[PDB]
Design a protein around this ligand. Structure first.
Ligand SMILES: [Mg+2]
Lengths: 370, 386
RNA sequence: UUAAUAACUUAAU
């Protein structure tokens, strides 16, 4: 699957490793986030290990008349329910039918809850498969959108949870996932558990990253749910910054977010990954945004210490030994003080000597600046 | 509105005042013109006074736009695939009569409404048109809807359809000519032929000033006059209206395009003579305007039209108490430069040249014009200084 | 000789 490929390129979940670091970041937001709620979600995130590999899956005239008579008000609610109960053996197959999907929709709009629960009991094991179907997705979102009882939501949550990651990857399934935000806490929690645990894999997909943004901006996400996923975004920022989709989440985090200390906490974490981020074409752009920001001095200060005044200049050496990104980054960073500027000038000159750096197109500007 | 500004810079219509002068210009056009038809057009032009100030779109309702988009995509997809009967199309169209007016301006709906008029039979077209006609003008000036409005007009096959279009477009006709898209919507009605397309020429004659001064209306007038469905009476009505508005058209490049078209047309006889006769009574504004004076200068320099340059020069220099020349030489940026250019042109003579020199000398003295950069060159030409 | 198809910025029958 696409999940298998990104799971291989992400390693073990940062939520598994840094359960205590995530709890601290959520605490260190200074937003009064209840840690017991956050930890229990990390608990249920680790508890629920069922993760799916793939998603596994009455002629035209007769269906049209059913839909025609329902739209015409020609039916009683009890008359619709007799029809529905007589099609339970087929209602799952119909949910993906180009005509059946419109009928199953009408069935859920008008039947009473016990019949909706009877239909859903036959559909639930296929809801994720219907959810990614071009036709079926209209029925699956309608089913979730009209889920009114507790028995209905639990059935949807139970049979969607193993496929929640795979849904975020899908052009239609990620909207099906978002439909579950209606359930509110605690039923919609499974969405944020999956987003936090697989923030690396989901964040690197074209749809999942955009669906994460949507979930975090949703009015039914509690602060704790937001804090859990955002903290996961932060401790994965060194991985998300390496591709455009992950960068979208980080861009969203810096700009369109109300989280206090997000800039500082993001910089603090990225300071231990300066060699890889500042040598990557896209990640270096973010590292510069964190330093160039004048209103975040603690970030720029900690980022500059780890950048130039390192254990043995190994951080600065790695960056300047890179060809396509490294030296351009360091030259920029400095060319935007005067006493402080010469102090950085001193450290750059030492590394370029030990690099044996030639003054070709890579080192023209930087060698002149120091 | 933007219409209010064009009429304020035009004044009241020259068609109302000079109803008999237009009839005069129509005669001296030669041609096979039935003169009585022209006057009855000026009559219908003045009777029909219901003119709209603005163009209002159909009120927008609330739609689940993505369920609506999928529906329209499939309708267009199945029509293009021939999977639909003409009856199946008409069933769908009849179910959307409450919606065709608002859909006509939609990015997708406009393509579907087009197909509906291409494929439905005439009763269903008339049924759709009865819902769309009061907004056709609005649809007509929409960047999307104009494709649907022009289609509806181009496929108007019955008399009931043309009359509906003419009925519900006439109040907005002037507004359509002003619009970058609506002016093509108005031209689509030229297909209707005489006498149904006459409303286009009535509006062009009454509002010749406002329309002829606009980038799109002036070019639309030129297109209508060159259209194969414009009778000689319709051409003469509008061209004569252009002549009696020449002093206003000559003040911008769009109206000047109409006058340059008329002169280079060579189909209307006595165009140069009739144009100069009218422009001789408006020498104050033309000879002081940057662009209009260019035309007046061309009308005199033309040696092959001697009668025109004689009437122009008599009214230029020999006016009551010198008020025409006074106004021109009182102007700074255009006036004096024009008179000097008229003098220093070897086509006047010498008996008349001294007569012109006398009056200009008298005006500049009675103006108390100083010999600065404006009047230095001209003052030496008549005496004054050296 | 003035022409011209919307927005969205992850949607879709
Ligand atoms: Mg798009």
């Amino acid at each position: 699957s696409e999940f298998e490929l990104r799971r291989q390129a992400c390693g073990r979940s940062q939520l598994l490793k840094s359960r205590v670091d995530i709890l601290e970041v959520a605490r260190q937001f200074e937003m009064r986030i209840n840690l017991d709620i956050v930890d229990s979600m990390i608990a249920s995130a680790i508890e629920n290990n069922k993760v799916a590999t793939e998603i596994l899956p009455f002629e035209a005239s007769k269906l049209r008349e059913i839909r025609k008579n329902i739209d015409s008000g020609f039916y009683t609610q009890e008359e619709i329910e007799v029809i529905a109960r007589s099609m339970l053996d087929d209602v799952a197959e119909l949910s993906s039918d180009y005509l059946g999907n419109t009928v199953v929709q009408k069935f859920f709009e008008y039947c009473s809850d016990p019949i909706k629960e009877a239909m859903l009991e036959r559909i639930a094991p296929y809801l994720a498969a219907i959810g990614i179907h071009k036709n079926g997705t209209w029925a699956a979102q309608k089913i979730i959108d009209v889920a009114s009882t507790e028995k209905q939501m639990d059935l949807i949550v139970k049979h969607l949870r193993p496929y929640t990651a795979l849904l975020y990857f899908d052009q239609f399934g990620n909207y099906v996932a978002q439909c579950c935000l209606r359930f509110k806490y605690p039923k919609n929690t499974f969405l944020f558990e999956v987003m936090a645990r697989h923030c690396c894999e989901i964040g690197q997909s074209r749809f999942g990253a955009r669906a994460i943004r949507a979930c975090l901006e949703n009015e039914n996400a509690t602060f704790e749910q937001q804090a859990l996923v955002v903290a996961s975004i932060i401790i994965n920022s060194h991985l998300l910054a390496t591709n455009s989709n992950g960068m979208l989440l980080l861009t969203w985090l810096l700009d369109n977010s109300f989280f206090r200390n997000r800039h500082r906490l993001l910089a603090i974490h990225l300071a231990t990954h300066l060699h890889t981020t500042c040598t990557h074409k896209l990640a270096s752009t973010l590292i510069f945004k964190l330093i160039n920001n004048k209103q975040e001095p603690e970030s720029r200060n900690l980022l500059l210490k780890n950048l130039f005044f390192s254990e043995k200049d190994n951080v600065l050496t790695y960056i300047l030994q890179d060809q396509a990104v490294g030296p351009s980054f360091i030259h920029k960073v400095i060319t935007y003080g005067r006493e402080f500027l010469a102090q950085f000038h001193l450290v750059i000159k030492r590394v370029l000597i030990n690099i044996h750096a030639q003054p070709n197109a890579v080192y023209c500007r930087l060698m002149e600046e120091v």
